[PDB]
Amino acid sequence: WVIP
Amino acid sequence: WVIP
Amino acid sequence: SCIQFTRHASDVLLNLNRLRSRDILTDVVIVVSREQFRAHKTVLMACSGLFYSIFTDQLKCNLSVINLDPEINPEGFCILLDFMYTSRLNLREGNIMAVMATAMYLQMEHVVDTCRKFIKASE
Amino acid sequence: SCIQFTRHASDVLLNLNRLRSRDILTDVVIVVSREQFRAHKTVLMACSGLFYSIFTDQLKCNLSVINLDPEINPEGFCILLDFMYTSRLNLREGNIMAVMATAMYLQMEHVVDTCRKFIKASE
Numbered sequence: 001w002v003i004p
Numbered sequence: 005w006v007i008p
Numbered sequence: 009s010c011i012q013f014t015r016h017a018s019d020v021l022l023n024l025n026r027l028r029s030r031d032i033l034t035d036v037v038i039v040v041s042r043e044q045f046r047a048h049k050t051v052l053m054a055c056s057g058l059f060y061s062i063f064t065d066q067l068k069c070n071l072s073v074i075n076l077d078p079e080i081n082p083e084g085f086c087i088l089l090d091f092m093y094t095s096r097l098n099l100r101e102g103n104i105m106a107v108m109a110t111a112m113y114l115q116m117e118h119v120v121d122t123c124r125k126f127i128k129a130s131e
Numbered sequence: 132s133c134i135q136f137t138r139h140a141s142d143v144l145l146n147l148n149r150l151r152s153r154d155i156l157t158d159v160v161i162v163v164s165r166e167q168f169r170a171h172k173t174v175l176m177a178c179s180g181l182f183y184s185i186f187t188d189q190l191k192c193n194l195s196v197i198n199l200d201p202e203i204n205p206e207g208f209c210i211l212l213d214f215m216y217t218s219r220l221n222l223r224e225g226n227i228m229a230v231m232a233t234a235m236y237l238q239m240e241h242v243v244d245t246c247r248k249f250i251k252a253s254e
């Protein structure tokens with residue numbers, strides 16, 4: 001999971 | 005396009 | 009010896025979401041405490057262990073309406089349906105418990121994992 | 132303020148290909164010079180400008196069989212159908228002309244672009  |  | 013187009017899967021999902029937003033070729037309504045959500049069976053199956061099991065059943069595969077367990081929160085389902093079609097999860101302090109419970113019921117393992125991690129950080 | 136799961140789109144496409152390989156919820160047959168290819172209308176639309184136009188037509192959206200132009204090569208179509216469901220293109224010296232012509236007819240702009248580039252390098 002990432003900060004888009 | 006890339007070499008997978 | 010194949011070549012691969014990096015953005016292809018993302019572009020496919022973006023177009024599937026465009027079809028959902030315009031209600032094009034949607035083939036099922038998911039009912040959650042009287043709230044109704046239109047979607048594509050194939051996308052639901054591709055994202056959820058529960059929908060995969062439902063639509064591979066020789067009788068349920070033909071249903072146009074699926075009713076979820078009355079304990080399922082419509083907002084939690086809506087957030088997860090948005091994630092299915094976009095890869096983006098709107099996870100907030102006020103919805104994390106409903107999102108995790110819905111993801112456990114829908115069998116969306118990666119969502120359950122990030123919810124467990126975000127809850128553990130707050131304790 | 133959404134979080135994003137990097138592999139989600141790829142995982143969705145991988146599951147859609149698993150459904151195709153097991154012939155699950157396929158809803159159309161594409162006929163190419165008597166060769167037949169089963170697929171999901173939504174995936175075809177998501178990858179091709181031609182299928183997008185076909186299945187948004189109020190009459191054609193309901194067809195279970197679509198016949199392509201007799202000039203279309205079945206191997207070129209097969210390679211492109213595989214690309215649609217995997218992001219992988221089996222581009223070879225012996226098939227590049229048939230693949231480019233089929234991609235132009237199907238309106239798959241990124242495939243047409245890489246074929247033009249690979250042909251230009253060989254001249």
Ligand SMILES: CSc1ncc(Cl)c(Nc2ccc3c(c2)CC(=O)N3)n1
Nearest residue numbers: 053054055057060115116117146149
């Ligand atoms: C297992 S083979 C397979 N073949 C095709 C499909 Cl459409 C499918 N979907 C599916 C099954 C289980 C789970 C998910 C999707 C997401 C998750 O967390 N668990 N699975």
Ligand SMILES: CSc1ncc(Cl)c(Nc2ccc3c(c2)CC(=O)N3)n1
Nearest residue numbers: 023026176177178180183238239240
């Ligand atoms: C244009 S809006 C839109 N909305 C939904 C879908 Cl399913 C769609 N597909 C599509 C249209 C045109 C093209 C492609 C896909 C691939 C390509 O090269 N050209 N387009």
Ligand SMILES: [Cl-]
Nearest residue numbers: 070071072073
């Ligand atoms: Cl029904």
Ligand SMILES: [Cl-]
Nearest residue numbers: 116117118119
């Ligand atoms: Cl997931």
Ligand SMILES: [Cl-]
Nearest residue numbers: 193194195196
């Ligand atoms: Cl027909």
Ligand SMILES: [Cl-]
Nearest residue numbers: 239240241242
């Ligand atoms: Cl393309």
